Paper text:
Several studies have shown that OTULIN binds directly to the LUBAC subunit HOIP (Elliott et al, 2014; Schaeffer et al, 2014; Takiuchi et al, 2014). OTULIN‐related autoinflammatory syndrome (ORAS) (also known as otulipenia or autoinflammation, panniculitis and dermatosis syndrome (AIPDS); OMIM ID: 617099) is a potentially fatal, TNF‐driven autoinflammatory disease characterised by sterile systemic inflammation, recurrent high fevers, panniculitis, diarrhoea, arthritis and general failure to thrive (Damgaard et al, 2016; Zhou et al, 2016).
Gly281 is evolutionarily conserved and located in a loop between helices α11 and α12. To understand the pathogenicity of the Gly281Arg mutation on OTULIN, we crystallised OTULIN's catalytic domain (OTULINcat, aa 80–352) containing the Gly281Arg ORAS mutation (OTULINcatG281R) and determined its structure to 1.8 Å resolution. However, comparing the structure of OTULINcatG281R with the previously solved structure of OTULINcat in complex with M1‐linked diUb (Keusekotten et al, 2013) showed that the Gly281Arg mutation partly unfolds the substrate‐binding site. The introduced Arg side chain can no longer fit into the narrow pocket between helices α3 and α9 thereby flipping the Gly281‐containing loop out of its normal binding groove (Keusekotten et al, 2013). In the mutant protein, the loop has increased flexibility, as represented by the high crystallographic B‐factor distribution across the loop compared to other regions within the OTU domain and also evidenced by lack of interpretable electron density for the side chains of Val280, mutated Arg281 and His282. The new conformation of the Gly281‐containing loop indicated that His282 and Thr283 would clash with M1‐linked diUb at the binding site and prevent substrate binding.
Residue numbers in the entry: 78 to 174, 183 to 345
The structure:
C-alpha cells in the first residue's frame, strides 16, 4: 500500500501551508512550529486514523532502534498472550483491527522486525526498512495489535497493584478514574477496541503507551504553547535508560513526527 508516514518535508514549509491568516490559533501554531524548528528541520505527516498515536510513536522508536530492548529479548513476551487470556477470559472481547495465536503472531512480528532494524549498520538502512514496513498493509496493523496488547497487560498489572495497595504512578489512578475506564475490561471495551474515525489514544493513555514500550515520549503540544505544557513528557520521571522519541501534537489527538 501507500506510505502511512509521509515523506519528510521542511517543517516551516509545512507550517506555512497549514497555518495561514491572522487568527490567534494560527499565530500560536506558527510560534509552536518556529520553536520546534530550532531542533528539527523536517516533519513527517502521520496518517490520522485511530492508530495515529501508535503509528507516530512506533515509527520513531523503530526507525531509531540501535538495539533490541530487554523487554523484547525476554522470552516471557511470547508467553504473555496465553497466560493473560487464560487467566482473564474477558480479553476475548478483543476486537481485531483464535485470539492467542493472532496476538502471539503479532508480538513475534514486532520482535522480529525490531531485531532486524537494530541489526542494521546505518540510520538510512533503518529508514528504508521502516518506509517499507509502514505501508498500510497487514504487517503494519499487526504491530498495533501487539502494542495494544502490551498496553492492556501493563494496565492489568497497574490495576492489580492498586488493588493490593501497592504504590502505582498517579497517571494510572487518573486512567482508572474515568467512568468509561474504571477497570481493565472497560479500558479494553471502551478505549482499546474503539470505533473507526472516532478513537485514538487520550492523554492519560499516552502514559500507558510509554510504559508498554518503555520509551520516553517527548511531545510538543502546540495547543499549549503559552503554558508550561508546551512540552509534556510521558512518563514524567522515566528510567534514564529508556530511549527518547519526540512527537508534535497540534491538539491532544493527532501526532506528527519531527525529524533531523
Ligand atoms: Cl504552497
Amino acid at each position: 500500500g501507500p506510505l502511512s508516514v509521509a515523506p519528510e518535508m521542511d517543517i516551516m514549509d509545512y507550517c506555512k501551508k497549514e497555518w495561514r491568516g491572522n487568527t490567534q490559533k494560527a499565530t500560536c501554531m506558527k510560534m509552536g512550529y518556529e520553536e520546534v524548528s530550532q531542533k528539527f528541520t523536517s516533519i513527517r505527516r502521520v496518517r490520522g486514523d485511530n492508530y495515529c498515536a501508535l503509528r507516530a510513536t512506533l515509527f520513531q522508536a523503530m526507525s531509531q532502534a540501535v538495539g533490541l530492548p530487554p523487554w523484547l529479548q525476554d522470552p516471557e513476551l511470547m508467553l504473555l498472550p496465553e497466560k493473560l487470556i487464560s487467566k482473564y477470559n474477558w480479553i476475548k472481547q478483543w476486537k481485531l483491527g483464535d485470539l492467542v495465536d493472532k496476538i502471539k503472531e503479532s508480538l513475534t512480528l514486532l520482535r522480529k522486525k525490531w531485531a532486524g532494524l537494530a541489526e542494521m549498520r546505518t540510520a538510512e538502512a533503518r529508514q528504508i526498512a521502516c518506509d517499507e514496513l509502514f505501508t498500510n498493509e497487514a504487517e503494519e496493523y499487526s504491530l498495533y495489535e501487539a502494542v495494544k496488547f502490551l498496553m492492556l497487560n501493563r494496565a492489568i498489572e497497574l490495576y492489580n497493584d492498586k488493588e493490593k495497595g501497592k504504590e502505582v504512578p498517579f497517571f494510572s489512578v487518573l486512567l482508572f478514574a474515568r467512568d468509561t475506564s474504571n477497570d481493565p475490561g472497560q479500558l479494553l471495551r471502551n478505549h482499546l477496541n474503539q470505533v473507526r474515525h472516532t478513537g485514538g489514544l487520550e492523554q492519560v493513555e499516552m502514559f500507558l503507551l510509554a510504559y508498554a514500550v518503555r520509551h520516553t515520549i517527548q511531545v510538543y503540544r502546540l495547543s499549549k504553547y503559552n503554558t508550561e505544557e508546551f512540552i509534556t513528557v510521558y512518563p514524567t520521571d522515566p528510567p534514564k535508560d529508556w530511549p527518547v522519541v519526540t512527537l508534535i501534537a497540534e491538539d491532544d489527538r493527532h501526532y506528527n513526527i519531527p525529524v533531523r
